[PDB]
């Protein structure tokens, strides 16, 4: 068992050997390297077929129709596309948008740009557990509200929103609902034939597909529309121009198909390892759980260690690959939203599990955390204070 | 004729590239040597459905182009 | 020698076995799969190094500084970024933009969107050979002009513009000059330390790198600025947010390094094959050359065959993989700009050469074209007319 | 000391991520075991240049952080 131990599957995951192998068949002179936009020869046509086989693979995971799937360069793009695309298309119905103060930066930074463009954006504070108050969401909705973006699973604390119910509130009022499902896709079940989501973002590299590819769900029925953000020939049914990257696209679709298969088995296994982990450390004195144990992603666990200087916490767990969620001095904007102070936020670690994670690694982790938080506290002027 | 197709793909009201997408998917869930009646009103299908059979190696059986809806019978 | 014979390197090229092999070292659990944005562990840091080694490789091809190179998902994105980014940033100096009526769709469609946003765009007609009249360009420039986009090498006819001189005209007036160099990068020499280009686009898959990656040059000195189009965390020095796709990025940089090396040798070889090709067909009766023989890319040859029904021309050269440049019934918008009628434009073929192209393939091509244009004309009511 | 560096990287006026980029490139065109005086005024370099030496496995020699410009002597 090698070190570091990767516990940062939420930052990015490694590409499946099965995925990477497919992606090899679409690269070199003897593979299917042709441009799926060339239709005067065989090269293009068979490439386009590869694209279509993957577009379906993706669709089937989330109960969509392939004609509802738009190819992008990543979840970041899907979020820009979805939000600015919808906001611009529907701007005549009103200019008000609502989102959550704990959304990923792609959503937050996108909304802030729209605020420059003349849009009004309400950023709702979450409760201490991370869930949005639906009645606070309702009190925000107006006549001139046109769009709501609230993510399925949060990538820092793992907390799951009630996207079904939010979807119902949106539809009943004619408001477009966008959902960032980067973290939830292939982890929690998703069926858009039932869900009242209009736009949904997802990527590949959080599910053992390659970085640099992702997609955007756009509801066919009832019809949702968006303005393209990427111009030049009108590909993807006018919504995202540019050469389609076949291999990238193939790798993503294969990853989504494996995900459909292995999902159930895998998320019950991770959900167990997650519970193995929190139990071997929940007994330590000043440790808090950020998020929800029952109704949180099976693979994310974000815990706070109190009365320890956080700068050195990470230097103490160098045997682990994790993240605190801080930004090139200052501290997770999500934990600060949850309400914790800067010092506590700074000494929080997010453990994120995945395909290659074992019990051996979890147990080693459990041990390391006790002995580490133990040593730091020994030498902590802060702990001695608490020990009064 | 256009009487005993085992499969019937209605693609009316669909516009390029949607028809080739729908047809593409159908041939996959099809057994090699099967019939497929395509009903389209997308004029681009006069070029694109023969193009499919040509570049994807299928059997373009009987055609219709001289009036809407167009009909295209295809075999895998 | 297999068939079809690929003569569509300008649509897309196959990925170099050397490139694809590097891209393998950055995928799976045992490679460098880490997110170059994670800096709390080794995974991220070494990934970021890979990115930096490639960013430099790219820079050195075009005489830029690595700090001037911005990663994008493709040439299409670079063109959107460059044009809307510059136009929006400098809009207080004026709202007028100038480009050429034969630019790639990424540039044209982008300008048309800006026209919706309140920008004024002049689309200059080219001369019959494809070159822009610099004095017509000068007559268009105004006080309130802020940006000019004219491509280095055209992708349909291969014609090269005087980007140096255009750059001088721009600088002297404080106008931002953007250059689409997708076709020229690694084909003609480029040195931005000397050239007065402010923004320059390029991709990877036109130089034996992978589809789905590309970059944008942004001049450091004198300082040019743009508004980001892709929000979410402010990566690439605030100009293009989103996870960097390492393998994609590595494959591109390797492709740009091979290009620096092999360029000279290769473009003298292609320039010879190009001349082999036009000579074995220039003797046919009604054939015209679109573009320039002396001052055109070494690897593109676009020829028109008169008095032949074009629909069947391609069906006649099924042994070749080329393109006419038509759009899912109607005919190359570039050839129509050059001035040719729709029938002639329809029966034009663009032959584009590359790394895997031989003399055997060229000669076979020469032969096929004579015998083909011969048979079509035999059965052409149009030729019999011309034969009066 | 800060007297006999064989290489001198001026990074004044540069801001993260530019310093780590410049330093990154310099160590490549450097021979294993060479000195490099980094002159920076980017405060983020107090975290990032030690982070470089730590995660890229180089020798952080002598430091300066208590006043601008900061100085960082490094060895491959
Ligand atoms: C990682 C992540 C993204 C970013 O996706 P990219 O493919 O890296 O651009 C967006 N949203 C969420 C919730 C994420 O976790
Ligand atoms: C092919 C091409 C593009 C498109 O680049 P992509 O990477 O496919 O998005 C842009 N400009 C020119 C001139 C091209 O030839």
Coordinates of C-alpha atoms in Angstrom, one line a residue, chain A residues 3-6 8-9 11-17 20-21 23-24 26-29 32-36 38-43 73 76-77 80 84 104-106 109-110 113 116 205-206 210-212 227-234 240-248 314 320-324 328 356, chain C residues 3-6 8-9 11-17 20-21 23-24 26-29 32-36 38-43 73 76-77 80 84 104-106 109-110 113 116 205-206 210-212 227-234 240-248 314 320-324 328 356:
Chain A
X3 CA 1.9 6.8 0.0
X4 CA 0.4 9.3 -0.3
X5 CA -3.0 7.8 0.0
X6 CA -5.3 9.5 -2.5
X8 CA -9.3 13.6 -3.1
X9 CA -11.5 11.9 -5.6
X11 CA -10.8 17.2 -6.8
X12 CA -10.5 14.7 -9.7
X13 CA -10.4 11.0 -10.2
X14 CA -8.0 8.7 -12.2
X15 CA -9.2 7.5 -15.6
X16 CA -10.5 3.9 -15.7
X17 CA -8.2 1.5 -17.5
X20 CA -8.5 5.0 -21.4
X21 CA -8.4 1.9 -23.6
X23 CA -9.9 6.4 -25.9
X24 CA -6.9 4.8 -27.7
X26 CA -9.8 7.1 -31.6
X27 CA -6.4 8.8 -31.9
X28 CA -3.8 7.7 -34.4
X29 CA -3.7 7.2 -38.2
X32 CA -11.0 6.5 -35.9
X33 CA -9.3 9.9 -36.0
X34 CA -11.6 11.5 -38.5
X35 CA -13.6 14.7 -37.9
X36 CA -17.3 13.8 -37.2
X38 CA -16.8 15.8 -42.4
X39 CA -19.6 14.0 -44.2
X40 CA -18.0 13.6 -47.7
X41 CA -16.0 10.5 -46.6
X42 CA -16.1 7.4 -44.4
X43 CA -13.6 8.9 -41.8
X73 CA -15.3 21.1 -22.5
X76 CA -17.3 24.7 -15.7
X77 CA -18.5 25.3 -19.3
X80 CA -21.6 29.0 -17.8
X84 CA -25.9 32.7 -19.0
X104 CA -19.2 25.7 -6.9
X105 CA -17.2 28.7 -8.3
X106 CA -18.4 28.0 -11.9
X109 CA -18.5 33.4 -10.7
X110 CA -21.0 33.1 -13.6
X113 CA -20.7 38.3 -14.2
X116 CA -22.5 43.1 -14.1
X205 CA -13.3 13.5 -14.5
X206 CA -15.3 13.1 -11.3
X210 CA -10.9 12.2 -18.7
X211 CA -10.5 15.9 -17.7
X212 CA -11.5 18.4 -20.4
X227 CA -28.5 31.2 -26.2
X228 CA -25.2 29.6 -27.3
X229 CA -22.0 31.1 -25.8
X230 CA -19.7 29.3 -28.2
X231 CA -20.1 30.4 -31.8
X232 CA -18.8 29.1 -35.1
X233 CA -20.9 26.9 -37.3
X234 CA -23.7 25.9 -34.9
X240 CA -22.2 24.6 -28.7
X241 CA -20.0 25.2 -31.8
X242 CA -16.6 23.7 -32.3
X243 CA -15.0 20.4 -33.5
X244 CA -16.3 17.6 -31.3
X245 CA -13.4 15.8 -29.6
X246 CA -14.2 12.2 -30.3
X247 CA -11.8 10.3 -28.1
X248 CA -12.6 12.6 -25.2
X314 CA -2.0 19.2 6.5
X320 CA -2.7 11.6 2.9
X321 CA -3.8 13.4 -0.2
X322 CA -6.8 15.5 0.7
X323 CA -7.7 19.2 0.7
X324 CA -8.8 21.8 3.2
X328 CA -4.0 30.2 -2.5
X356 CA -9.5 2.4 -5.6
Chain C
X3 CA -8.1 3.6 -49.7
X4 CA -9.6 6.1 -49.2
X5 CA -6.5 8.3 -49.4
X6 CA -6.7 11.0 -46.7
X8 CA -8.2 16.4 -45.6
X9 CA -5.5 17.2 -43.1
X11 CA -10.4 19.2 -41.6
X12 CA -8.3 17.5 -38.9
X13 CA -5.1 15.5 -38.7
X14 CA -4.3 12.2 -37.0
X15 CA -2.5 12.3 -33.6
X16 CA 1.3 11.6 -33.7
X17 CA 2.3 8.2 -32.2
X20 CA -0.4 10.0 -28.1
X21 CA 2.3 8.1 -26.1
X23 CA -0.7 11.5 -23.4
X24 CA -0.8 8.0 -21.9
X26 CA -1.1 11.4 -17.7
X27 CA -4.3 9.3 -17.4
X28 CA -4.6 6.3 -15.1
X29 CA -4.0 5.7 -11.4
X32 CA 0.2 11.7 -13.4
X33 CA -3.6 12.0 -13.1
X34 CA -3.7 14.6 -10.4
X35 CA -5.4 18.0 -10.6
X36 CA -2.8 20.7 -11.2
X38 CA -4.6 20.9 -6.0
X39 CA -1.5 22.3 -4.1
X40 CA -1.8 20.5 -0.8
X41 CA -0.2 17.3 -2.2
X42 CA 2.4 15.9 -4.7
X43 CA -0.2 14.8 -7.2
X73 CA -10.7 23.8 -25.5
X76 CA -13.1 27.9 -31.8
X77 CA -12.9 29.0 -28.2
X80 CA -14.6 33.6 -29.3
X84 CA -15.5 39.0 -27.5
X104 CA -13.4 30.7 -40.4
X105 CA -16.9 30.4 -38.9
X106 CA -15.6 30.8 -35.3
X109 CA -20.2 33.7 -36.1
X110 CA -18.6 35.5 -33.1
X113 CA -23.2 37.8 -32.2
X116 CA -26.4 41.8 -31.8
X205 CA -5.6 18.9 -34.0
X206 CA -4.4 20.6 -37.2
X210 CA -5.5 15.9 -30.1
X211 CA -8.9 17.5 -30.8
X212 CA -10.5 19.4 -27.9
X227 CA -12.5 40.0 -20.4
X228 CA -12.8 36.3 -19.5
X229 CA -15.7 34.4 -21.1
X230 CA -15.3 31.3 -18.9
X231 CA -15.9 32.0 -15.2
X232 CA -15.3 29.9 -12.1
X233 CA -12.2 30.4 -10.0
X234 CA -10.1 32.5 -12.3
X240 CA -10.0 31.1 -18.7
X241 CA -11.5 29.3 -15.6
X242 CA -11.9 25.5 -15.4
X243 CA -9.8 22.4 -14.6
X244 CA -6.8 22.2 -16.9
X245 CA -6.9 19.0 -18.9
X246 CA -3.3 17.8 -18.3
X247 CA -3.0 14.9 -20.9
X248 CA -4.7 17.0 -23.5
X314 CA -17.2 13.7 -55.0
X320 CA -10.1 10.2 -52.0
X321 CA -10.9 11.8 -48.7
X322 CA -11.3 15.5 -49.4
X323 CA -14.0 18.1 -49.1
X324 CA -15.8 20.6 -51.2
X328 CA -25.2 20.3 -45.1
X356 CA 1.7 10.7 -44.0

